[PDB]
Design a protein around this nucleic acid. Structure first.
Length: 758
DNA sequence: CCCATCGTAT
DNA sequence: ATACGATGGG
């Protein structure tokens, strides 16, 4: 047996389609192609795969062989090798195992993986039918969605077919939903058209669980054939060039929004901080008020009529809703669709009617209403000391960033100064924004209307619930009083979302691009948890050995890597990288990162600055005593030295790590061989040296004094490859009497990984 | 031109 | 399993 796909992606796309509902299947190979068939765990969902000869680039099957294998294992081997490589299945007349063989256009890379076959009882039932009461084909896209959606309402979906009508229906405890589509043919984009041939209407019901499995076949085809019958199992078929994948399954007040996205955005700001709320509807619009569990955060929404494309009310109605169930319905289908809220005189439930831009596509849902009491709420006239407004996206960042440090955030308002502060166990953090009016980008202006200084503390828990409404307005209004609740408002067109909140009672090294130091720390934060940052007049260096003592990480950042550098006195900054990460994530990758430390260091200062903005985010990490490591100065001669793209070396490692906990590197003349041999099967990657003038960063240099054959723990190599963010290339020095060297050369710096072979 | 969906990679 | 990128459709 020898069958090669032109594109390895194809075979991956096939396996992925049915790999989640079957653990073990048999592939019966014949002269006329490959075929497979299996059932799910419950044994009601039958899957059948047929791959004809014309589906391959080359197919040769000496003798009918049956290949039983575990899809989990196979799919792991299918993740390997670029999806543009030529995949080739090879099996002997009596196979102990099957051999997969990847090969790109060039001869540079050659991947050969082997999987161990199994003994399965396979009787391929080759059976389809001639007559289905109805037959239809729709984009597997639209279908996958329809199913994923109605699966939130019920455990059983229902398909109902009539002439020129396809109706999917679901009924559950929270509510019901029905999607009606009609047959149409698109001349310009046929891949979106809907075919329907009805010999006779059908009203079959199918378990949602199985449909959820079936829709995974969308990875093979842009379309999905469905054949229904009141006497036969339904046929869900995904066609592929010269073949197909089949799933056989046996049946069992009106307020209209121009954009549906608005209502979603509103509910999003509501949920997560409030459970259920009464939507009070009147002729002048809709209002809703809810408090959080602890009753310290009040949410006040007011939607004016002008916010609707069309709005009408005969009489005031109150709709009690569970925002969780509500958001489930709001999930689908399109954000741009026309949303409409219908309700009868004595509302037992509310009906949401989604309508696409296309006249054809329709979807309506019905949410069962709750019973909630409104009383009692009273808002005394509130006077505020300070009043500011700023880009919601900016305020959102500040909150999210500072939330990382403390469970409490402090807002301080002084004359022409707004200071956000958070103080936690690892260290503090303060962002200081300055009021300014900008003619260009006037939306990003920071207004301040202060009558008297204010110092208020809030639980980060609640500020994170407030920033949820940032999707409603470019800006956010903040009224702050010392005796009144803090008010956070998001302005809608003809409306608003308000949040009432109750207070609480409690060395100079400037990086050109902050992102640089961030990707550096990410390069070895997984290898070592605690590390000293020794700072000298010539730059920053760090040596660290993990607890296992097998890996040595050597960092070095030269002065030429900074936009500015000063060192009056050699300082050492012992830091917890896990802490340093949280802080490095806050500031922008483009912002200027300045490290500041006093002569007698107790803490380090990380300073994030903007280009033309007064905005300054200063952070502070608490240092800790880390005992330095014992340095071994080894000057030796390696057996072999190779350099390759760190992007390639990374893929190679991640691919083989799936097979074994050990990866063997074996250098021979003009050949580099990476081999992982695990239980499920052994995979092997073989690269060859070559130079490419046009693109030098794709070359592979290989100098060898003597063949090498070392094994490294995949656990460690997975950490070493994370330096691929620092350099396009990775240096590899290998020796039999010495630890391997993995080097990533930065600009005016480097990151060395000295790993010890097993 | 913008938005949504699907596929691929990490 | 999640995130990012690319392609297709509206």
């Amino acid at each position: 047996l020898e069958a090669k796909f032109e594109e390895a992606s194809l075979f991956k796309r096939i396996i992925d389609g049915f790999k989640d509902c079957v653990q073990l299947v048999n592939f019966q190979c014949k002269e006329d192609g490959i075929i497979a068939q299996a059932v799910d765990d419950s044994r009601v969902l039958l899957v059948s795969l047929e791959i004809g000869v014309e589906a391959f680039q080359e197919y040769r099957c000496d003798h009918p062989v049956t290949l039983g294998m575990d899809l989990t294992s196979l799919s792991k081997i299918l993740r390997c090798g670029n999806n543009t490589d030529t995949l080739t299945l090879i099996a002997d007349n009596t196979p102990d195992s099957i051999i997969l063989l990847f090969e790109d256009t060039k001869k540079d890379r050659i991947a050969e993986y082997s999987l161990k076959l199994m003994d399965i009882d396979a009787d391929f039932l080759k059976i389809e039918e001639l007559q289905y009461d109805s037959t239809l084909s729709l984009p597997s896209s639209e279908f996958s969605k329809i199913v994923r959606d109605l699966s939130q309402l019920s455990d059983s979906i229902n398909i109902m077919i009539t002439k020129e009508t396809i109706k999917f229906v679901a009924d559950g405890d929270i509510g019901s939903g029905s999607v009606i589509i009609k047959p149409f043919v698109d001349m310009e984009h046929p891949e979106t058209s809907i075919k329907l041939e009805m010999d006779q209407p059908v009203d079959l019901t199918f378990g949602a669980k199985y449909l959820l499995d079936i829709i995974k076949g969308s990875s093979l085809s842009d379309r999905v054939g469905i054949r229904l019958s009141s006497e036969a199992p339904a046929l869900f078929q995904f066609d592929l060039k010269s073949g197909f994948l089949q799933f056989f399954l046996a049946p069992k007040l009106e307020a209209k929004f121009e954009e549906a996205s608005l209502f979603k955005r509103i509910i999003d700001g509501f949920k997560d901080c409030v459970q259920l709320v009464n939507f009070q509807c009147k002729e002048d619009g809709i209002i809703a008020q809810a408090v959080d569990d602890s009753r310290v955060l009040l949410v006040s929404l007011e939607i004016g009529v002008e916010a609707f494309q069309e709005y009408r009310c005969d009489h005031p109605v109150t709709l009690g809703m569970d925002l969780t169930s509500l958001s489930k319905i709001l999930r689908c289908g399109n954000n741009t669709d026309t949303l409409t809220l219908i309700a009868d005189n004595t509302p037992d439930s509310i009906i949401l009617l989604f309508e696409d831009t296309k006249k054809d596509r329709i979807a309506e849902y019905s949410l069962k209403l709750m019973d909630i009491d409104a009383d009692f709420l009273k808002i005394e006239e509130l006077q505020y000391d300070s009043t500011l407004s700023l880009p919601s996206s900016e305020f959102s960042k500040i909150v999210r960033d500072l939330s990382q440090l403390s469970d409490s955030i402090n807002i301080m308002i002084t004359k022409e100064t707004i200071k956000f502060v958070a103080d936690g166990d690892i260290g503090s953090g303060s962002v200081i924004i300055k009021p300014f009016v900008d003619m260009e980008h006037p939306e990003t202006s920071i207004k301040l209307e202060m009558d008297q200084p204010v110092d208020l503390t809030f639980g980060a828990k609640y500020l994170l619930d407030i920033i949820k409404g940032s999707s409603l307005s470019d800006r956010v209004g903040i009224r702050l009083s010392s005796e009144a609740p803090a008010l956070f408002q998001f302005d809608l067109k003809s409306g608003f979302l308000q949040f009432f909140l109750a207070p609480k009672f409690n060395l100079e090294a400037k990086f050109e691009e902050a992102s640089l130091f961030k990707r550096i720390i990410d390069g070895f934060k997984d290898c070592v948890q605690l590390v000293n940052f020794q700072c000298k007049e010539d730059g920053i260096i760090a040596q660290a050995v993990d607890d296992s003592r097998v890996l040595l990480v050597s960092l070095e950042i030269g002065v030429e890597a900074f936009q500015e550098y000063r060192c009056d006195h050699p300082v050492t900054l012992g830091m917890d990288l896990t802490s340093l990460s949280k802080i490095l994530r806050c500031g922008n990758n483009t912002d200027t990162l300045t490290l500041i430390a006093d002569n007698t260091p107790d803490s380090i200062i990380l300073l994030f600055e903007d280009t033309k903005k007064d905005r300054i985010a200063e952070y502070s990490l608490k240092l800790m005593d880390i005992d330095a490591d014992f340095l071994k100065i080894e000057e030796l001669q390696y057996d072999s030295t190779l350099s390759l793209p760190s992007s390639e070396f990374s893929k190679i490692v991640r691919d083989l790590s799936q097979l074994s906990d050990s990866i063997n590197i074996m250098i021979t003349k003009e050949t580099i061989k990476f081999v992982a041999d695990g239980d499920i099967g052994s995979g092997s990657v073989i690269i060859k040296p070559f130079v490419d003038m046009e693109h030098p960063e794709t070359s592979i240099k290989l100098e060898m004094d003597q063949p090498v054959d070392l094994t490294f723990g995949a656990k460690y190599l997975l950490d070493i490859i994370k330096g691929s963010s620092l350099s396009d290339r990775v240096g590899i020095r290998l020796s039999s009497e010495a630890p391997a060297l993995f080097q990533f050369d930065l600009k005016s710096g480097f990151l060395q990984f000295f790993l010890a072979p097993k």
